[PDB]
């Protein structure tokens, strides 16, 4: 239970960086947390996932370039994107789960374009 609004997307040249910020005005986050992309011609893959233990998982394609972190108080998760490549171009969505209390909750995404 809450809503997710995310920001921090934009256009950058390869090698640049960006920081995605995912806020929840209704705020719980006290779970399982992730970022997934879904470029067109699509299907989405999970870019980063942080557990309730604060365990951190990334796919091999992203490994080390992205960092997931979570800010207490105000509900926010940050996806720190470094050394961006044209393959990273996609809308980026922030999702939450309680793990097995079910379904992820989407968010209206942020567009990211590496030109």
């Amino acid at each position: 239970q809450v809503q997710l609004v995310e920001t921090g997307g934009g256009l950058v040249q390869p090698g640049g960086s960006l920081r995605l910020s995912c806020g929840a005005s209704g705020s719980i986050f006290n779970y399982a947390m992730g970022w997934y992309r879904q470029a067109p011609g699509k299907q989405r893959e999970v870019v980063a996932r942080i557990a309730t233990d604060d365990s951190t998982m990334y796919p091999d394609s992203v490994k080390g370039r992205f960092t997931i972190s979570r800010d207490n108080a105000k509900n926010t998760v940050y996806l720190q994107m470094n050394s961006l490549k044209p393959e990273d171009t996609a809308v980026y969505y922030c999702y939450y789960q309680r793990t097995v209390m079910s379904q992820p909750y989407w968010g209206q995404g942020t567009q990211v374009t590496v030109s």
Binding site: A32, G34, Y36, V46, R49, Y95, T99, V100, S102, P104
Partner: peptide, 14 residues
Amino acid sequence: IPVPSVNTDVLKLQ
């Protein structure tokens, strides 16, 4: 009843 080795979020959004 989920499998012990699932991260269940990725089972959806698959």
